[PDB]
Design a protein around this ligand. Structure first.
Ligand SMILES: [Zn+2]
Ligand SMILES: [Zn+2]
Ligand SMILES: [Zn+2]
Ligand SMILES: [Zn+2]
Ligand SMILES: [Zn+2]
Ligand SMILES: [Zn+2]
Ligand SMILES: [Zn+2]
Ligand SMILES: [Zn+2]
Lengths: 145, 145
């Protein structure tokens, strides 16, 4: 299955490719920096250097497998292009990118475009803010509902 | 009044500056390309070249008077930074940038950030779509509610 999608993009089905795909399918890691991906890759105990993680993730974007984005101006973050629709809530103190989908917003967005003669075809919604209490740079649980 | 705000930014209060400010305060032109601003400037019959409109609008951004944005990837569009909060609905066939504000969305946005430990401090919401009926490149009335 992962084997099939890799070929559909144009990449030979190596193990480090299949292993990075599997980290990008974990729920905690739908939005992950190249390094945090390597941090996960070494917790699972894969001898896969950080330079190779960069190598592969860049190749994946070329083949439309993943989208990169600099939500923090600097820190690049990668996600599986093939995913259900969500928008992005980003914490400005610790860098955490949180996904979310609101059906009443996606609906009003269609309603607002249709009021002005427009059929909504794409949109981007980025939320930015600060940790409400304490310091999220310590509590890894700070941004989980 | 326009005189005061111009000084607050650091610019001498010339007439072409005050005249461009006045076009950027008209309701039709809250979001206007440099040229469409010159098109308005010549309807009012001001002998103000298009090159000077670029000159001034760039100076205004430096002094935080206006924000530029390339909503269409290419076409630059300018607006008065000092304005009530709105978001942006952009027509992909004709380039029209439409402003809008929804109180139920701005409220849910605060609710969604607060669910994940975040106090919402900034956000950007861009809507993109195509003209629903006919061809808006003809009907200037296509995107007015
Ligand atoms: Zn995402
Ligand atoms: Zn959305
Ligand atoms: Zn945080
Ligand atoms: Zn902060
Ligand atoms: Zn605007
Ligand atoms: Zn808004
Ligand atoms: Zn249009
Ligand atoms: Zn179209």
């Amino acid at each position: 299955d992962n084997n099939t999608a890799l070929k559909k993009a144009g990449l030979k089905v190596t193990l480090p490719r299949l292993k990075i795909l599997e980290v990008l399918q974990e729920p905690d890691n739908h939005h992950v920096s190249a390094e945090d991906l390597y941090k996960r890759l070494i917790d699972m105990g894969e001898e896969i250097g950080l330079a190779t993680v960069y190598r592969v993730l860049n190749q994946f974007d070329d083949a439309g497998i993943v989208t990169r984005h600099n939500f923090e101006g600097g820190k690049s973050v990668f996600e599986l292009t093939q995913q259900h629709h969500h928008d992005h809530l980003i914490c400005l103190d610790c860098g955490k990118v949180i996904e979310f989908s609101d059906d009443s917003i996606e609906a009003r967005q269609r309603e607002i475009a249709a009021k002005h003669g427009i059929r909504l075809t794409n949109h981007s919604l980025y939320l930015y803010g600060h940790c409400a209490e304490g310091d999220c740079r310590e509590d890894e649980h700070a941004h989980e509902g």
